[PDB]
């Protein structure tokens, strides 16, 4: 009655903290947010955060809900 | 629950001005007064501010807190920013409808010169 | 009535405290009060035949250690999961 699964979507973090990225570089692929778009980072339609600017990757909890953001710092 | 509703409307318009990094002219309206500040792209502290609460713009007025008073602040906050060299400001409604006094204040800053 | 001899713990940790238990002692702690917590060692089968009383957990005790008696209350006891052996005692100042 079972037997079906799907192809694995290769989600997760592609560039970790302190990594230097070019602009347009995908930083995290995700389904929901689970990671919000901080400075110099777009959200994308499937919520794929991506570097809007060259610089280093920066994760930080910030906000009234302790949500993880991702900034980009040149 | 008038303030709890209003900061809920502003806090989407307060963003896209932090993620844009735009100088915010923020307007605060109240029954009898009208306030305005110009705040830097950072969230830290203001650059110029003007209101009717200062006694300069108190008895230059027939009444504090109406649309002719909001146009008094509209010239006041704008003419005090250009002398500091601040234009290309972005207007923040701060939860008020851009209709009445706050329309009369942004209109009277666009005449006095604030680039939006 | 209950007077307990103790020695200061020189090494704390996991393998340190497993050696104390295999050598028929067991570790303890005296926290509470102004002073810093005092990691101590008791001998097992003298304290085990002393905590079988109901008033080891009720009255103030007296832990003598290197020339100091500290008026203490037993605060929490980690026992062995199934053997009748203690694994730790918490003492508070009193």
């Amino acid at each position: 009655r079972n037997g079906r699964d799907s192809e694995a979507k290769r989600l997760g973090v592609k560039r970790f903290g302190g990594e230097s990225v070019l602009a347009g570089s995908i930083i995290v692929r995700q389904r929901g947010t689970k990671f919000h778009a901080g400075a110099n980072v777009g959200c994308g339609r499937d919520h794929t955060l991506f570097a809007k600017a060259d610089g280093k990757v920066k994760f930080e909890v910030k906000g009234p809900k302790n949500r993880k953001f991702i900034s980009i710092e040149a | 629950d008038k303030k709890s509703a209003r900061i809920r409307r502003a806090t989407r318009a307060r963003r896209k001005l932090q993620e844009l990094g735009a100088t915010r002219l923020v307007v605060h309206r109240t029954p009898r007064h009208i306030y305005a500040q110009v705040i830097a792209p950072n969230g830290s502290e203001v650059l110029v501010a003007a209101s009717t609460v200062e006694k300069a713009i108190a008895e230059q007025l027939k009444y504090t807190g109406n649309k002719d008073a909001a146009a008094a602040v509209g010239k006041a906050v704008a003419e005090r920013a250009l002398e500091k060299g601040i234009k290309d400001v972005s207007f923040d409604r701060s939860g008020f409808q851009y209709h009445g006094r706050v329309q009369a204040l942004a209109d009277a800053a666009r005449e006095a010169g604030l680039q939006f | 009535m209950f007077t307990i001899n103790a020695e200061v713990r020189k090494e704390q940790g996991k393998g340190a405290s497993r050696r104390l238990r295999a050598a028929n002692k067991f570790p303890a702690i005296i926290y509470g009060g102004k002073e810093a917590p005092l990691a101590i060692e008791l001998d097992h089968d003298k304290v085990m035949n002393m905590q079988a009383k109901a008033e080891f957990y009720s009255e103030v005790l007296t832990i003598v250690v290197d020339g100091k008696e500290i008026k203490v209350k037993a605060q929490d006891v980690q026992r062995h999961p199934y053997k009748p052996k203690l694994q730790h005692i918490d003492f508070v100042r009193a």
């Binding site: 079972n2 | - | 037993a74 006891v77 026992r79 999961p81 199934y82």
Partner: protein, 136 residues
């Protein structure tokens, strides 16, 4: 025998049984039957030892079963091959670690309880000891 009235899932994985138990104190009664070995208590065993305790105390004094059979053990029929999906759920066990209080009792004298917990221990596949309640 004990069994969950409903579960969200019909079959579980096999899992493992590593570690020591979390409910290790006599919480409710006075006298306990603590497990000192490790294994699986099927609901047939828990019920057989529940009767053997109750019959020994002559329906007197309260009796707690501190464990519950909430793991569905499957078993493939005879003369069937390997594969063809997981087999069918045939009984329910409780995983038992060393230190688990299996049963509890009060309302009886202790020598009637140590007698009744000796009759229950011969129904279980797990070596067990008799423990009484401790303040702290």
């Amino acid at each position: 025998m004990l069994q969950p009235k409903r579960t969200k899932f019909r079959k579980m994985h096999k899992g493992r049984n590593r570690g020591l138990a979390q409910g290790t104190d006599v919480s409710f009664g006075s006298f306990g039957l603590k497990a000192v070995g490790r294994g699986r208590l099927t609901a047939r065993q828990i019920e057989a030892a529940r009767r053997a305790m109750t019959r020994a105390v002559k329906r007197q004094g309260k009796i707690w079963i501190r464990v519950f059979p909430d793991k569905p053990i499957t078993e493939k029929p005879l003369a069937v091959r390997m594969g063809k999906g997981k087999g069918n759920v045939e009984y329910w066990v409780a995983l038992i670690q060393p230190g688990k209080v299996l049963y509890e009792m009060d309302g009886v004298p202790e020598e009637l309880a140590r007698e009744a917990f000796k009759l229950a221990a011969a129904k279980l596949p797990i070596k067990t000891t008799f423990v009484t309640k401790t303040v702290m």
